[PDB]
């Protein structure tokens, strides 16, 4: 399906595959209670992410083991790019959930966390200045799903070409010049390098939390974490 869709039809399919914004179990902070809240939430979103991924055109065509490999590789990038998108209207703050809007000061409650907070806030700031659109956001999110572990295949790259066609088409439709289109595409795609960075840091931190026995992790969360070894 993915390869023969018009760019408008690809946008729509991605838009109606979107998982909902969930809520936190919220309600003082401690390092244990904050990691608890964030991992409870992460685990619940992961179940929706599994269902969202199964509604991404092109993802549905892959083998089960390729699907798994890619979800494992990209799961935290994906949580992170959602978090950032959510946090656009809330500068200086991170909207993990509508009832869990955290600032920099609150990130300090957990050891090693504030550095990742700052990166996420910078990413969210970058999207705000670029005036990122939702249609661009869902394109980006699906690029991550298909791209991040694609080197860890021809079909995957063709679907990626399709999503590139789709981003451009949106930019063109919004009145941008050819030069502005390819520049903005580059800008968007270069941010994924930073999102990959933020993921590998987040992955190390979570692993440090498990090792220090800060928080108990569900099996799902422990499997995703374990795929990064």
């Amino acid at each position: 399906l993915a390869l023969s869709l018009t760019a408008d039809q690809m946008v729509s399919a991605l838009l109606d595959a979107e998982p909902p914004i969930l809520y936190s179990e919220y309600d003082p902070f401690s390092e244990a209670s904050m990691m608890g809240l964030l991992t409870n939430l992460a685990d619940r979103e992961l179940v929706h992410m599994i269902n969202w991924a199964k509604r991404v055109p092109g993802f549905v065509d892959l083998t089960l083991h390729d699907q798994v490999h890619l979800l494992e590789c990209a799961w935290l990038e994906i949580l992170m790019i959602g978090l950032v998108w959510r946090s656009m209207e809330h500068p200086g703050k991170l909207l993990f959930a509508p009832n869990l809007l955290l600032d920099r000061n609150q990130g300090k409650c957990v050891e090693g966390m504030v550095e990742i907070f700052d990166m996420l806030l910078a990413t969210s700031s970058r999207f705000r200045m670029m005036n990122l659109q939702g249609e661009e956001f869902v394109c980006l999110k699906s690029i991550i799903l298909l791209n991040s572990g694609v080197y860890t295949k021809d079909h995957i790259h063709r679907v990626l070409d399709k999503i590139t066609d789709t981003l451009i088409h949106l930019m063109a439709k919004a009145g941008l010049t050819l030069q502005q289109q390819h520049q903005r595409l580059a800008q968007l795609l270069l941010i994924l390098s930073h999102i990959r960075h933020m993921s590998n840091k987040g992955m190390e931190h979570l692993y440090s939390m498990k090792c220090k026995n800060v928080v108990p992790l569900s099996d799902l969360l422990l499997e995703m974490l374990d795929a990064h070894r």
Binding site: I50, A53, K54, L64, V68, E72, D219, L220, M224
Partner: peptide, 11 residues
């Protein structure tokens, strides 16, 4: 296979 594998195929 992992828990993930089922979750993904049945979901």
């Amino acid at each position: 296979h992992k828990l993930l594998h089922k979750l993904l195929q049945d979901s």
